[PDB]
Amino acid sequence: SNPYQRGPNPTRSALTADGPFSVATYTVSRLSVSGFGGGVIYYPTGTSYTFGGIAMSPGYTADASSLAWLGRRLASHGFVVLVINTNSRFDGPDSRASQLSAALNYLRESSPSAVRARLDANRLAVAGHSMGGGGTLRIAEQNPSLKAAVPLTPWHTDKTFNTSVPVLIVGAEADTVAPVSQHAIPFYQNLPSTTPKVYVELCNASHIAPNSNNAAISVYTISWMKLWVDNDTRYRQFLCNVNDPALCDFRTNNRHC
Ligand code: NA
């Protein structure tokens, strides 16, 4: 049952560290691609399987190296992950959406053959930090063929996204760049009530929390990607009946349980 199932039955511990797949990396040079600023692909190796893909955007003024840990973390749990650089580090959220869109096409059509051979391009998802998270919401609304969207400490001036793509948002309690009351929470509460949606808020975290190894971000991102990109119900346990001391708020419409 479930052709997309990969890796062992999960434990909470296992989801806070790199997973069972060896990871290869490929550098996409900035000038080799029109449509986005290049980036790094983290993808499984030593294996005959194919896996879903994820395009992931860094935040305002940031480089792809800022999410390198999470690009590696997700790939080692069984995903082909492209962390982009933006055409300009000053690009806003909707520009970032367009570049994720280009990056997804690139993964499908133009990435190296060793990458393409590991990818099932029928199963794609998006994630992003800050302004990259605002881009993540925009593209989920523009392109509902995406399997999941994970905005991290997201920023956008538009507060309503009418998308059917399952969304999990990570807010940071002490975030002063994109305050959760202005940004993350309105995004959560304005998504359609028929869309599977989860909001998690990190206790005592600021806007830079996604920029380094973070256990909660690791668990909830892996779990959401696994549940929706791989249809993997072994991961519902981390997302249902949640009682997590790391969190200072949790909201859900419970469609995923
Ligand atoms: Na709080």
Numbering used by the authors: 2 to 258
From the paper:
Enzymatic degradation of PET using suitable hydrolases, like the leaf branch compost cutinase (LCC) variant ICCG, offers potential for PET recycling under relatively mild reaction conditions. Computer-aided enzyme engineering performed by Tournier et al. introduced an Ile at LCC position F243 to enhance the enzyme’s catalytic activity by further expanding the substrate-binding site. Additionally, thermostability was increased to 94 °C by disulfide bond formation between D238C and S283C in combination with mutation Y127G. In this study, ICCG was utilized for the application of a crystal contact engineering strategy to increase crystallizability and test the rationality of the applied approach.
Thus, not a Glu-Lys interaction (as intended in), but a Glu-Arg interaction, was anticipated for the introduction of an electrostatic interaction at the crystal contact: Q6E (R139) and T110E (R119). On the contrary, the occurrence of initial crystals for mutant T110E (6 h) was highly decreased compared to the WT, with the crystal size slightly increasing with a comparable crystal amount (305.7 µm ± 78.2; 21 crystals). Additionally, the mutant crystallized at a reduced protein concentration (5 g L−1), indicating a shift in the nucleation window to reduced crystallization conditions. The crystallization onset at a reduced protein concentration was also slightly earlier (20 h). In crystals with the mutant T110E protein, the distance to intermolecular R119 was reduced to 6.2 Å. Although one T110E rotamer reduced the distance to R119 even more (4.5 Å), this rotamer clashed with neighboring N114. Nevertheless, negatively charged T110E, surrounded by an uncharged surface, pointing to the positive cavity of R119, supported the establishment of a long-range electrostatic interaction. The proximity of ICCGY mutant T110E to R119 indicates an established long-range (5–10 Å;) electrostatic Glu-Arg interaction at the crystal contact, confirming the successful extension of the approach. The nucleation window shift of T110E to a decreased protein concentration (5 g L−1) combined with a 77% reduction in the lag phase until crystallization (6 h) compared to the ICCGY WT (10 g L−1; 26 h) fulfill two criteria for increased crystallizability, as defined in the introduction. In contrast, mutant T110E, which was designed to introduce an electrostatic interaction at the crystal contact, crystallized better than the ICCGY wild type regarding crystallization onset and had an extended nucleation window towards reduced protein concentrations.
